[PDB]
């Protein structure tokens, strides 16, 4: 029948999760942001739509730092991005507290991944309305 796109954790008959696909529409609607991997680092950039002359230039910062070595940028629902980064920061601190070393970027990527995936497992939460581009430098590049 129908109604498969009303709850988050529900599989449609073709094996899809429509609420996640609808979250993608929120991202596609957002500002454009990018990442570029260079031969000893990474670069992030983002478009900030100036709605009016009243917006103070150079303030309203969108790119966020995690620990001291990771940058995150995202497109879509900005608050959802901040929420994700707050989690990332909690998660990076935990890793450093126990293991001393700064969190490697692959390790950090999965921490965000597992958290975002968790928000597709239950109907009592909605998926994240962002796609996040992030990275940095660690022990091996």
């Amino acid at each position: 029948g129908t109604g498969y796109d009303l709850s988050n954790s529900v599989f449609s008959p073709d094996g899809r999760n429509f609420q996640v696909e609808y979250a993608v529409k929120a991202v596609e609607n957002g500002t454009t942001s990018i990442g570029i991997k260079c031969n000893d680092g990474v670069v992030f950039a983002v478009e900030k739509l100036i709605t009016s002359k009243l917006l103070v230039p150079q303030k309203n910062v969108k790119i966020q730092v995690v620990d001291r070595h990771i940058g995150c940028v995202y497109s879509g629902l900005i608050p959802d991005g901040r929420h994700l980064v707050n989690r990332g920061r909690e998660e990076a601190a935990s890793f450093k507290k126990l293991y001393k070393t700064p969190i490697p970027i692959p390790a950090f990527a999965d921490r965000l991944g597992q958290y975002v995936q968790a928000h597709t497992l239950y109907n009592s939460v909605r998926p994240f309305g962002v796609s996040t581009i992030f990275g940095g430098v660690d022990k091996n590049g």
Partner: protein
Amino acid sequence: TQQPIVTGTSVISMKYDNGVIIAADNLGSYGSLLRFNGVERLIPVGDNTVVGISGDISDMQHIERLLKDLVTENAYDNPLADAEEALEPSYIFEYLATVMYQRRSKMNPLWNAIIVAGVQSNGDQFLRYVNLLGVTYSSPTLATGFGAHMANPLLRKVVDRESDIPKTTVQVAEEAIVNAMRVLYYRDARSSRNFSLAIIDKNTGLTFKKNLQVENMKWDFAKDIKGYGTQKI
């Protein structure tokens, strides 16, 4: 409630006309065993603050990690993290003071005595003490442990009240600190000859000096000392 195992002795400090000096030796004692000789007990925070810590070294290392987390956290979503919204000595201290008093109130202290030395953004000298009881106080000279009993008397001869501060120079202040470290090496049984010294100056910034040694010691008179009363040879 606990007991200190690996310990650091005196931390001594004073302010001068343009800033503050702070020093502490490089020893981690284990009771009467002089166990570790490469222990840095001065913790710089940014370019304007040095925290000197005595007492339990395991707790010092925990406090050390708290301070690194403070710097990280302060830089989050903070475009002015290395300008107007950088950490002041006063913020570092008030944070530490809060923690020290909460831990004593939980009957589980950080078994330390801490001196935060620095220069605020407006140029003012910052020097304040806090310990395991959460007790705080400011003075033109501050010292922990044996330094309180032996260094303060010497340092107070240079800066006896607030008005002596603008009259006191870096050279005179540093010499007074260095002399006090020699005196502590003479009479404190848990002291080391090797120490670190840090100057924070409102003009010349943070100057951190490692691997200093007590020099110009007087011992020659010991040869003339024989017996304990009546013995002649």
